Ligand SMILES: Nc1ncnc2c1ncn2[C@@H]1O[C@H](COP(=O)(O)OP(=O)(O)NP(=O)(O)O)[C@@H](O)[C@H]1O
């Protein structure tokens with residue numbers, strides 16, 4: 001399958017139908033000419049499977065009706081450049097020249113600037129282009145461009161406005177250079193965007209990109225990273241008397257992953273990697289760039305269970321192995337519930353503090369006193385396990401309530417883990433979850449990285465449903481309390497009932 005291109009002639013996807021026209025006007029106002037096409041990429045929600053992506057564990061995301069639109073115009077210039085315009089005053093106009101030799105544009109994390117994120121998508125698109133038409137792009141520049149950007153994904157909301165942006169850009173950039181007769185495959189799109197953020201210093205998994213790219217209206221996705229990168233859409237189960245609905249409630253606590261990366265995001269990545277390596281050593285194995293927790297799982301099994309072949313995702317076998325993994329964590333990491341010092345670790349790995357450091361603490365700077373290897377691994381394994389179960393549910397119920405509860409429970413377990421083991425929750429999240437559970441929710445948890453941002457709630461929808469009940473309670477018990485100045489409008493914007501949206505796409509003009 002390819003990324004869908006739409007035209008004027010083309011019923012048009014709601015979102016396109018609804019937003020293009022306007023963006024189109026903005027572009028004219030901005031550049032005094034009509035754009036050539038419009039690239040879109042949505043935001044996303046992760047139903048379950050938090051902070052396991054970077055360990056190669058599979059997740060349960062969904063694309064939402066919030067997106068990023070890029071109106072583009074392709075230019076013929078002697079000395080090609082890129083002009084960036086944003087609908088949001090917050091984002092100032094940027095303009096830069098593309099190296100004539102066909103080299104890459106410098107990305108400097110030293111600065112927190114929106115153009116950086118653009119450059120990120122540019123880069124990946126570029127790299128890809130070089131491979132595709134080396135002839136054309138080897139030592140020559142890409143087309144200059146005029147870009148107008150308008151996103152409705154709330155920033156630092158944990159709904160990944162970041163990925164919606166990057167993906168839209170990568171898409172647009174490939175199209176602009178390949179031309180109209182060229183059609184991107186969702187797979188390539190995905191595959192190239194999944195690491196874009198690393199350029200900006202954030203070592204995340206590709207969950208965000210995978211969802212933005214693979215979303216399908218009315219479909220949830222089961223994203224896998226190994227043995228192969230893959231997204232598989234599915235429809236929720238059909239209940240008899242009810243609707244499966246997911247409600248998002250923004251805490252309104254701004255959480256930008258980059259800003260706190262060293263003590264937050266990136267610190268987690270380190271603890272888990274570290275843990276993976278300690279376990280190895282503790283079990284006398286060699287992991288392989290260091291190995292991850294999934295790596296340890298395969299190796300152990302390979303070395304001690306004689307299983308030659310690496311885990312394929314088979315659900316049943318997975319449940320089994322993870323459970324086991326949980327046992328080993330308990331058996332070997334639990335003595336340091338308090339945390340491992342660099343000393344404890346280095347000793348654990350037969351290292352010098354310097355080795356540990358070169359090898360682990362320098363690729364990305366992190367700040368800490370201790371490393372919580374026990375809890376982080378524990379979370380990872382258990383959260384992974386939770387996914388496998390969720391998938392089974394979503395796939396294989398007498399009473400509707402049987403699903404509500406079962407799935408809800410998993411969600412609740414995930415929240416607890418996130419909060420107690422991974423420590424990425426927050427009072428506001430905590431408060432939202434409590435209110436929701438008591439008022440109609442079956443499962444409540446943060447979504448995305450945590451440390452603020454949004455929450456997801458499994459609530460029975462439709463006529464026989466409780467959406468309004470929850471909404472109301474939240475309004476009265478949380479928002480109106482924590483944010484007295486909040487307006488019905490803002491409120492409305494803080495609570496959303498989500499429907500799976502379509503992923504990346506194109507509009508031609
Ligand atoms: N609408 C937008 N327009 C321009 N740049 C954007 C936009 N949305 C995101 N960006 C850039 O991408 C960065 C990351 O998105 P942001 O939402 O702020 O934080 P995040 O924690 O990385 N992701 P998330 O919380 O999941 O949305 C921002 O700080 C901007 O530099």
Ligand SMILES: OC[C@H]1O[C@H](O)[C@H](O)[C@@H](O)[C@H]1O
Nearest residue numbers: 050051204205207208448449
């Ligand atoms: O699950 C937490 C989530 O955090 C951010 O949203 C990252 O971009 C994702 O790759 C993922 O790790």
Ligand SMILES: [Cl-]
Nearest residue numbers: 104105123126
């Ligand atoms: Cl580049």
Ligand SMILES: [Mg+2]
Nearest residue numbers: 158255257449
């Ligand atoms: Mg975030």
